[PDB]
């Protein structure tokens, strides 16, 4: 979905201030040419959207859509691709209209779309075109939401946006309840090794598969064990065939980052209860068991790189070496002989990766430094140490050292002598603060990871895994999560519709081999044609027991939990079931930041910005308005003089804090002095 993306803005297109309110709307000629759900939700809403599923681009650059032509009330199977003008010329029927299994319509009055987007009924003689399918009007990633027809549009928008920010875990189990658009949307994304030509497997390992073709030839497919993606996530590719099988041309032969047996898999299937629990799951917070930390259910691998380059300079040439001046022998243990680290050394924040030293030049010394060097006898050591230290708050192993050179004749840029890249990799668990979400836009950070025993269990001893909140469901109109929870519990336990005296009345229009299913079975409700509510009731009534004679969930879909902490049962039955949640890329370790005293800006003398540097937070205009509105003035004087710009004030504040004296009275800011000099340089006498 980063490809197949339509953007109304760019070079030769309108900017966001020229973007009127009219261009962000959904014109009624978007049916099947551009998805109305999937779009960003910031200030760029409606300007960026994605293509639909069956849409196709014209030779001239228009967007064509298929339609089944119906002749004289007989729906044919010829397919005509139609652009918007021809879509306006005719009238176009509905997708799920009751065809009479001959091409004929059941009812004489059919819903239809007129020229200008009017929605009317019509006698069936006038209809000359029909849709190819439901879910034609919707995108790729929005067609992967189960029970979309029950949600709203804004929470479906949030679900379709937050579906793509999922991270790859280590296990990557396929979802129980999904739509039909996982297999196609996984093998068409190219991140799955697919057998080009049929044959039989000769040899498998964790790196290479060699199939044997039908005529003599063989072919090695090389995997990608732990490649780094473009954002710091893992890219494993494990094989899923054994050494005797026979693959056909097009068979999935190896999983990708987020795949399981070919189809997509973005998270795990987790048991959930919908009670509010002691204010920890308050206002879109999610609590979890300790089983997810223990059994490594939610655990992603993140791989970062660090890069440094030994180059020439004016005074000489920097060298990568072990002999770093003014350093101990304690930090020089992990370093090997050529200066870089070994492979496998677990590092912490502030340790030496590449030992590089610069020619310092000539400087004069302070007399205290001079007599201290005379006292300890140590020499001058005229070269200055500038190594590559791993930044603040990072750890993990060291995977691989790819070091280039000039002498080995590599394409290095002009003036550079030795390039070297070190790859650090950590294995992040789940933690309170990390952002989780389902597939219907029900996001929420992790409030508190409970232990296992103080977690409300069923009448079987099975503990629940996460506990959602009740008050966030009915005011957001996304009961698709409750329907998905019910159908997930049915698909996990498995059912058997007892057609002893005939097929019952709810399941008369169900397919065959859905009257009964094994436990842990997979199902697939498509987007706009799926499991009905009456069929959900009928499936949930007959729900064959676990190990004993025990139907833990009654016909309402609820169970009688026990309080794991106090001991008594909860006095009312509580909805449980098997939901599917994903771990998003909004982890805490990329957000937590602090600063005592770091670097400063160049022209003005303020502290710097962002977690990439050290940087401090921005105390803007509205917060100054709040501090004025309190009447608190001394704190405003603090924050505007002796923390940002008082160049002689900062060091006195630091010395006063360390020695234990009172904070001195502040002075004028250097930014004001810069203002004064610019006003004097605009030929304005400011006295």
């Amino acid at each position: 979905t980063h490809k197949r993306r339509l953007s109304a803005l760019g070079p030769g297109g309108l900017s966001r201030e020229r973007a009127g309110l009219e261009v962000r709307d959904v014109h009624p000629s978007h049916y099947g040419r551009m998805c109305p759900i999937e779009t960003p939700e910031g200030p760029n809403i409606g300007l960026i959207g994605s293509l639909s599923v069956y849409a196709r681009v014209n030779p001239f650059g228009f967007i064509e859509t298929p339609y089944r032509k119906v002749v004289d009330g007989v729906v044919s199977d010829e397919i005509v691709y139609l652009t918007a003008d021809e879509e306006d010329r005719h009238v176009v029927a509905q997708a799920n209209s009751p065809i009479d299994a001959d091409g004929r319509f059941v009812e004489p009055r059919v819903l239809v779309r007129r020229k200008a987007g009017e929605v009317e009924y019509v006698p069936s003689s006038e209809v000359d075109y029909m849709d190819v399918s439901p879910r034609q009007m919707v995108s790729v990633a929005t067609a992967m939401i189960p029970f979309l027809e029950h949600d709203d549009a804004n929470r479906a928008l949030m679900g379709a946006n937050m579906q793509r920010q999922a991270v790859p875990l280590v296990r990557s189990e396929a979802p129980l309840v999904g739509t039909g658009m996982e297999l196609r949307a996984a093998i068409d994304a190219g991140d799955v090794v697919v057998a080009e030509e049929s044959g039989v497997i000769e040899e498998v390992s964790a790196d290479y598969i060699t199939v044997m073709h039908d005529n003599g030839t063989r072919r090695t497919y090389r995997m990608r064990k732990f490649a780094r993606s473009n954002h710091g996530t893992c890219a494993n590719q494990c094989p899923i065939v054994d050494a005797g099988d026979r693959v056909e041309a097009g068979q999935v032969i190896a999983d990708g980052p987020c795949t399981d047996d070919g189809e997509m898999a973005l998270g795990k299937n987790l048991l959930v209860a919908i009670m509010p629990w002691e204010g920890h799951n308050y206002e879109d917070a999610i609590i979890l068991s300790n089983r997810l930390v223990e059994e490594d259910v939610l655990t992603s691998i993140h791989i970062e790189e660090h890069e440094i380059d030994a180059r020439d300079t004016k005074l000489g040439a920097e060298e990568i070496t072990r002999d770093i001046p003014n350093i101990s022998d304690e930090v020089l243990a992990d370093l090997d002989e050529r200066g870089i680290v070994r492979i496998g050394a677990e590092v912490r924040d502030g340790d030496i990766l590449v030992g590089k030293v610069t020619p310092k030049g000539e400087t004069e010394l302070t007399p205290e430094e001079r007599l201290l060097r005379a006292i300890f006898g140590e020499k001058a050591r005229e070269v200055r140490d500038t190594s590559l230290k791993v930044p603040h708050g990072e750890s993990g192993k060291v995977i691989g050292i790819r070091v280039f050179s000039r002498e080995d004749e590599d394409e290095l840029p002009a003036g550079v002598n030795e390039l070297v890249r070190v790859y650090v990799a950590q294995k992040r668990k789940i933690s309170d603060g990390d952002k989780l979400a389902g597939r219907h836009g029900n996001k929420g950070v992790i409030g508190k990871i409970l232990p296992v025993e103080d977690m409300p269990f069923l009448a079987d001893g099975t503990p629940v895994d996460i506990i959602l909140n009740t008050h966030g469901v009915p005011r957001r109109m996304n009961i698709g999560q409750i329907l998905e929870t019910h159908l997930g519990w049915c698909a996990h336990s498995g059912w058997k519709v007892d057609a002893a005296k005939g097929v019952p009345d709810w399941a008369a229009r169900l397919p065959d081999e859905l009257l009964e299913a094994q436990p842990n079975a997979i199902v697939s409700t498509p987007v706009f044609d799926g499991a009905q509510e009456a069929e959900l009731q009928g499936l949930l009534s007959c729900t064959l027991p676990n190990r004993d004679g025990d139907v833990l969930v009654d016909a309402d879909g609820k169970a009688m939990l026990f309080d794991g902490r106090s001991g008594e049962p909860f006095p009312y039955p509580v909805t449980v079931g098997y939901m599917y949640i994903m771990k998003l890329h909004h982890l805490v370790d990329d957000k937590i930041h602090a600063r005592s005293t770091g670097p400063y800006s160049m022209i003005t003398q303020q502290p710097l910005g962002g977690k990439a540097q050290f940087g401090g937070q921005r105390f803007g205009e509205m917060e100054c308005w709040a501090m004025q509105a309190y009447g608190a003035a001394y704190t405003l004087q603090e924050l505007l003089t002796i923390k940002s710009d008082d160049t002689v004030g900062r060091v006195k504040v630091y010395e006063a804090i360390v020695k234990g004296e009172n904070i001195p009275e502040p002075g004028i800011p250097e930014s004001f002095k810069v203002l004064l000099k610019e006003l004097q340089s605009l030929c304005l006498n400011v006295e």
Partner: peptide, 27 residues
Amino acid sequence: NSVPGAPNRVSFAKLREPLEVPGLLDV
């Protein structure tokens, strides 16, 4: 269906469709 290594994922879909999904990188 019609993909040779597919897992048997049973569907609740009531109505047949004529056209399979085109190649998603075709644009």
